[PDB]
Write a protein that binds this ligand. Structure first.
Ligand SMILES: CC(=O)OC[C@@]1(C)C=Cc2c(c(C)cc3c2[nH]c2cc(O)ccc23)O1
Length: 483
């Protein structure tokens, strides 16, 4: 080997634990990079804003149903709802009418198979934490997915060791041999696809396109207009972006770099623009102000990505069976809670950063409805309510009586950040929010059954040693309800 002793210890620990060679190849290349000085930082001087992009609302032509016969739907399914106090797979959260996130995508795929394309493939990227519950859920409710779960559906996210910041050796932990491993970010989909052989199996069987998206994003549905736009424009990697708002100033954004290839002898000097992603972790403390300027950098990544699979395979093969994404170098501790434990580096990548790895890569701006993540219990309440309606093809869209905008829900963080607090609020029923512009709740409150809210409502309780109960049938119209 040409590896350092620290890197050697890393591969030895990973080979012992039966980690596959594609994950080892990819991690060690990041390890070598970090041992040569790479920090992950992207200053403002290194990038330019991106000003002009095509939009999805300018498109009208849909594709043939032949293209959908060669399309795979991949959902990220590694997330636990820890932010909402959950222990299990976020996708198994009841979101509307007794159905989960997973229910809706599976019903959307089931619909497309019967009506459009029987060979549309559905895959899930699971972690060790979400696999068993995901498998059990499919056994009970979707046996056609359960029968082919291991062979076709499930894609396992691998784990990588944390390394110390001084030696870059694999950190050891006597208490827990589990706190010495970590996930490598969702950029690991490429490593897992290639390393398991499933990417080769897919191109072999004739699949051309893959639509990847977060499992907790209900707006991420197949749109035939995007597939036609990729065919016609001969695009290999397409990222959906949205216009940034001040609510999104602390999240990542799209950026631009240029590569001048000099013309040999008497020639014209060529130009190629290259798109890239910059998240907050990659931004230096000095440039955080320019990071949050939503007029300089005005687009953010939805994680709705479209990939031409044969080109992905070829590009990874040309790199020796890996995709060399920019490494994000987290500075944390072996035990995350305890700041006495040794300082480590947690190396991860972002699947959206692959937009820089392709010549024919592009980004298309889409409406915000394509990015409807459920990350707070406030988002859940809006989605549970009649403000959202299911279509015949099992999508979730706003009711027309919402005038293009979901109701705005501000729930007290002291009582409703956790799911157990939120389910107490809607214990007797979730109110009608379809005609509601805004609703904000402060203090301990319980709705009643058959409640209807209109306009802008505020329900506040100042007494934290008490609960405010709203009776059944209560109508609340542009008011403040208080004890
Ligand atoms: C800002 C802008 O320039 O519009 C373009 C675009 C893509 C992005 C903004 C945007 C939108 C739609 C259809 C809905 C919302 C939205 N931003 C939101 C913020 C909210 O809090 C709630 C709902 C929305 O369209």
């Amino acid at each position: 080997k040409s590896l350092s002793a620290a890197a050697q210890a890393c591969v030895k620990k990973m080979r012992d634990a039966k980690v596959n060679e594609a994950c080892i190849r990819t991690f060690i290349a990041q390890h070598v990079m970090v041992s040569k000085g790479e920090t992950g930082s992207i200053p403002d001087s290194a990038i330019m804003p991106v000003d002009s992009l095509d939009a999805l609302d300018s498109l009208t032509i849909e594709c043939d149903n032949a293209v959908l016969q060669s399309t795979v739907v991949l959902k990220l399914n590694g997330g636990l709802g820890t932010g909402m106090g959950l222990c299990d797979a976020k996708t198994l959260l009841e979101v509307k009418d007794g159905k989960t996130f997973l229910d809706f995508t599976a019903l959307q795929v089931q619909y497309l198979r019967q009506h459009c394309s029987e060979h549309l493939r559905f895959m899930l990227m699971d972690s060790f934490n979400t696999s068993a519950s995901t498998k059990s859920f499919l056994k009970a409710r979707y046996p056609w997915l359960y029968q082919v779960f291991d062979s076709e559906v499930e894609l396992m996210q691998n784990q990588v060791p944390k390394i110390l910041q001084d030696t870059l050796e694999p950190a050891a932990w006597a208490e827990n041999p589990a706190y010495e491993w970590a996930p490598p970010g969702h950029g690991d989909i490429y490593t897992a696809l290639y390393g398991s052989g499933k990417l080769q199996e897919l191109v072999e069987q004739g699949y051309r396109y893959m639509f990847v998206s977060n499992g907790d994003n209900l707006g991420a549905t197949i749109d035939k207009r995007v597939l036609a736009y990729m065919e016609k424009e001969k695009i290999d990697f397409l990222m959906e972006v949205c216009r940034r708002t001040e609510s999104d100033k602390k999240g990542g954004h799209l950026a631009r770099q240029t590569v001048y290839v000099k013309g040999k002898d008497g020639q014209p000097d060529a130009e190629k623009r290259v798109l890239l992603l910059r998240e907050s972790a990659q931004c230096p403390k000095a440039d955080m102000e320019s990071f949050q300027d939503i007029n300089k950098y005005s687009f953010f990544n939805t994680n709705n990505l479209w990939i031409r699979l044969p080109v992905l395979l070829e590009t990874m093969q040309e790199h020796g069976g890996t995709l060399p994404l920019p490494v994000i170098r987290n500075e944390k501790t072996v035990d995350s809670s305890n700041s006495a434990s040794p300082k480590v580096y947690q190396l991860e990548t972002a699947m959206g950063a692959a937009i820089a790895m392709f010549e024919s890569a592009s980004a298309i701006v889409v409406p915000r409805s394509r990015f409807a993540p459920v990350k707070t219990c406030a988002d859940l309440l809006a989605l549970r309510s009649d403000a959202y309606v299911v279509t015949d093809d099992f999508r979730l869209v706003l009711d027309d009586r919402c005038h293009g905008h979901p109701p705005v829900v501000d729930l007290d963080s002291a009582h409703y950040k956790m799911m157990n607090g939120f389910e107490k609020l809607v214990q007797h029923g979730v109110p009608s929010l379809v005609e509601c512009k805004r609703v904000t709740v402060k203090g301990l409150v319980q709705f009643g059954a058959g409640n209807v809210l209109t306009g802008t409502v505020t329900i506040e309780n100042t007494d934290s040693a008490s609960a405010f109960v709203i009776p059944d049938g209560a109508k609340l119209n542009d008011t403040t309800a208080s004890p």
